[PDB]
């Protein structure tokens, strides 16, 4: 029985999608099927922000951020709890989490 | 109306409609409400043709008058915008009102305290009063609705094209329906204005009632 209408991937109107490697296990997962997270995180953690700011040579330095694109296989994305299993009805909800 | 000069819409009615904003619909248009709108403004709002609105209001008044027992007409409003208007309509006309939550099974569950079997059913908004509309398809119950441009017309037999969003427009629409029903019945004449003003049907939110007093 068909679990998903899109077969768990985002491929329409094409035959082949180039694979990528899961950031955790290095599994070969198609780019459309893979679960992608774009993490924009401060290089300095919030606990260390004040201590780094005081030791700054320049006043008003605004610390840089980290830009890392994360690719996940289904197994590692489920294990890491980035995605969870949902009900048959809530599976269809494509809206990203409001956070 | 029947093209009668007696049933034609007067200037006072158009003044009330324009003041209440009844002619102003929404940015969306249901494909079954296309015959009731006139044009779409530069800001996307659809203008509701007041000729068609008056025609459908008079048709609904005829349908209500044809129900011999006034209590067999049921008026429904789940939204607070039309609630007080529904109670005023029921008081003036004699219909049975349901203001607020419509209990499912009201029309279908005979073993139930609040079980009623109306002969006609009038709602303020088909999208907001979808439960009584759905239950009206179980008991052979014809339905009249106040429908905006985006209102769905399933189970709606007489859709009155009007802005059912604004409180002024909803109150005016219910007030005019009551006035036309009374005029068609015989009580109160159409040669002089009705003694009840439309603002008796308007919804007043807590901020408004606190400010006014």
């Amino acid at each position: 029985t068909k679990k998903r209408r899109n077969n768990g991937r985002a491929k329409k109107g094409r035959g082949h999608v180039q694979p990528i490697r899961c950031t955790n296990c290095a599994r070969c997962v198609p780019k459309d099927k893979a679960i992608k997270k774009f993490v924009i995180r401060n290089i300095v953690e919030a606990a260390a922000v004040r201590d780094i700011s005081e030791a700054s040579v320049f006043d008003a330095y605004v610390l840089p951020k980290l830009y890392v694109k994360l690719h996940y296989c289904v197994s590692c994305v489920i294990h890491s709890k980035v995605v969870r299993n949902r009900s048959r009805e809530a599976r269809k909800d494509r809206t990203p989490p409001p956070r | 109306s029947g093209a009668l000069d007696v049933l034609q819409m007067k200037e006072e009615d158009v003044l009330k409609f324009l003041a209440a904003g009844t002619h102003l619909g929404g940015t969306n248009l249901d494909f079954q409400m296309e015959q009731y709108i006139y044009k779409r403004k530069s800001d996307g709002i659809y203008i509701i043709n007041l000729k068609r609105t008056w025609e459908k209001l008079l048709l609904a008044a005829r349908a209500i008058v044809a129900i011999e027992n006034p209590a067999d007409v049921s008026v429904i409003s789940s939204r607070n915008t039309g609630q007080r208007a529904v109670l005023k309509f029921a008081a003036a006309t004699g219909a049975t009102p349901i203001a607020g939550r419509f209990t499912p099974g009201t029309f279908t569950n005979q073993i139930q305290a609040a079980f009623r079997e109306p002969r006609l059913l009038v709602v303020t908004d088909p999208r907001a009063d979808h439960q009584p509309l759905t239950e009206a398809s179980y008991v052979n119950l014809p339905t009249i609705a106040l429908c905006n441009t985006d209102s769905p017309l399933r189970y709606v037999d007489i859709a009155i094209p009007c802005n059912n969003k604004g409180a002024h427009s909803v109150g005016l629409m219910w007030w005019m329906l009551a006035r036309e029903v009374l005029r068609m019945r015989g009580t109160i004449s159409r040669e002089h204005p009705w003694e009840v003003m439309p603002d008796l049907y308007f919804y007043r939110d807590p901020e408004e009632i606190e400010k006014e007093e």
Binding site: - | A20, K39, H168
Partner: protein, 132 residues
């Protein structure tokens, strides 16, 4: 926990709706009147009912609560339902009307009206929310 069950809650609601006259704000007076006007077969349950009656009296002294339909607040609400302004809010001397609705009224055989002021249509067709 101190969650009141349906028994004491419903008994308090009925007692307040039916004898709102006699009940006050004091636990002792509420206890005495509750003992008088109801057959409560236990004293612990009577005390619980009286305590919830006092709590709900405080609740309703600060506004209307949905479970109780006392006659005074219903009379006040119904009086508020009959309020009618001195002049109708639809009795505007001037009604602002867009050119398209004016053309509709012209097709409606109502073009001679002088209450209507034609407003400038908005030259921006930006009425939809951006997608994303």
């Amino acid at each position: 926990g101190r969650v009141r069950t349906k028994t004491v809650k419903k008994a308090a609601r009925v007692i307040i709706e039916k004898y709102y006259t006699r009940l006050g704000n004091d636990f002792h007076t509420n206890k005495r009147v509750c003992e008088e006007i109801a057959i409560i077969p236990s004293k612990k349950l009577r005390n619980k009912i009286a305590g919830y009656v006092t709590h709900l009296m405080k609740r309703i002294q600060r506004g209307p609560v949905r479970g109780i339909s006392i006659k005074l607040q219903e009379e006040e609400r119904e009086r508020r339902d009959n309020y009618v302004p001195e002049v109708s809010a639809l009795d505007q001397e001037i009604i602002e009307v867009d050119p398209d609705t004016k053309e509709m009224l012209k097709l409606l055989d109502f073009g001679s009206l002088s209450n209507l002021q034609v407003t400038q249509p908005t030259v921006g067709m930006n009425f939809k929310t951006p997608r994303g």
